[PDB]
Design a protein around this nucleic acid. Structure first.
Ligand SMILES: [Mg+2]
Ligand SMILES: [Mg+2]
Length: 254
DNA sequence: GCGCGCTGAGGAGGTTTC
DNA sequence: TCTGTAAAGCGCA
DNA sequence: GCGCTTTACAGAGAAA
DNA sequence: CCTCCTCAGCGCGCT
């Protein structure tokens, strides 16, 4: 990878991965994993390549196929993973998972009984300005998008053929995170908090759309998975929708 | 040559955030 | 994540 | 006062 | 995203 394609990785992991210290009979299993739709087998192997470690597995949970990259080897974790996340730390209230994980690990905790009682605080760690001002952000956001962003098109009413074309992204307990992104890309839609503590950001404007495209075209790194394809197909329909077409530039990649 | 302490690949059950 | 629905804003004819 | 455009709000599940 | 369990199996210190 690049100095920065790793920042891309914590991005992806923050949004779709997970740190976990689980019960393994008498002992513990330390791991980092991402489980994605089989639609990203190809991406899973690009991650293994970048990181250089990790076990890949497949399963059906019967009609949905899925791929997973899983790193449980503690030496490899200490030797390759911590370092990444130390250098390019996550931003959301998730770092609590990594800090907790890290500590238990470095402490040499190997039994369930000496493993601290842990529960993620919903309490944020940063606030807009700090996220937005960290160097690697631009890259991180690319992966975070790879992971949780959504490109889509839908008619506004059943009957008539008036398309909308939106880009959205949400996160539980992440008002500060979601808002910060919102600021960064200059959206002005109102971030919506749902039934859960899930902050949803969504845009439809000709100017908003114009903006992700530009952020992406000028982001340090690149989307390389299914989301990349989702975006390219989006791009495409964006040409058959006039209001957008006579209003922005677009396709070669990302 | 074996029993012990501990480990991770392999395999899979159970919730819920996107 | 992905796709809406019901309901506005904004000219302008 | 009607065409075109954005927006607040939010419900299923597949993909986490 | 999150969690648990089985089982070769590896290095040790003994019988
Ligand atoms: Mg996530
Ligand atoms: Mg994803």
């Amino acid at each position: 990878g690049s100095d920065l394609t790793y920042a891309y990785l914590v991005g992806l992991f923050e949004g779709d991965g997970y740190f976990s210290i689980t019960k393994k009979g008498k002992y513990l299993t330390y791991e980092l994993g991402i489980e994605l739709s089989i639609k990203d087998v190809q991406l899973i192997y690009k991650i293994k390549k970048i990181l250089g470690i990790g076990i890949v597995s497949f399963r059906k949970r019967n009609e949905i196929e899925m791929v997973a990259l899983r790193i449980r080897d503690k030496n490899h974790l200490k030797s390759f993973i911590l370092p990444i996340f130390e250098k390019y730390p996550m931003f959301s209230n998730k770092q609590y998972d990594y800090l907790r994980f890290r500590n238990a690990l470095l402490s040499g905790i190997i039994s369930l009984e000496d493993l601290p009682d842990y529960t993620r605080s919903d309490e944020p760690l940063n606030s807009i300005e700090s996220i937005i001002n960290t160097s690697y952000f631009s890259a991180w956001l690319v992966g975070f998008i790879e992971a949780e962003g959504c490109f889509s098109v839908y008619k506004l009413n059943k009957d008539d053929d008036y398309l909308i074309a939106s880009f959205d992204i949400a996160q539980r307990d992440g008002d500060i995170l979601i808002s910060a992104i919102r600021k960064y890309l200059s959206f002005t839609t109102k971030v919506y908090l749902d039934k859960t503590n899930c902050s949803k950001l969504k845009v439809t404007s000709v100017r908003s759309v114009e903006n992700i495209i530009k952020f992406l075209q000028n982001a340090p790194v690149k989307l390389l998975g299914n989301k990349k394809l989702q975006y390219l197909l989006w791009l495409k329909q964006l040409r058959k929708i006039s209001r957008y077409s006579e209003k922005i530039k677009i396709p070669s990649n990302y």
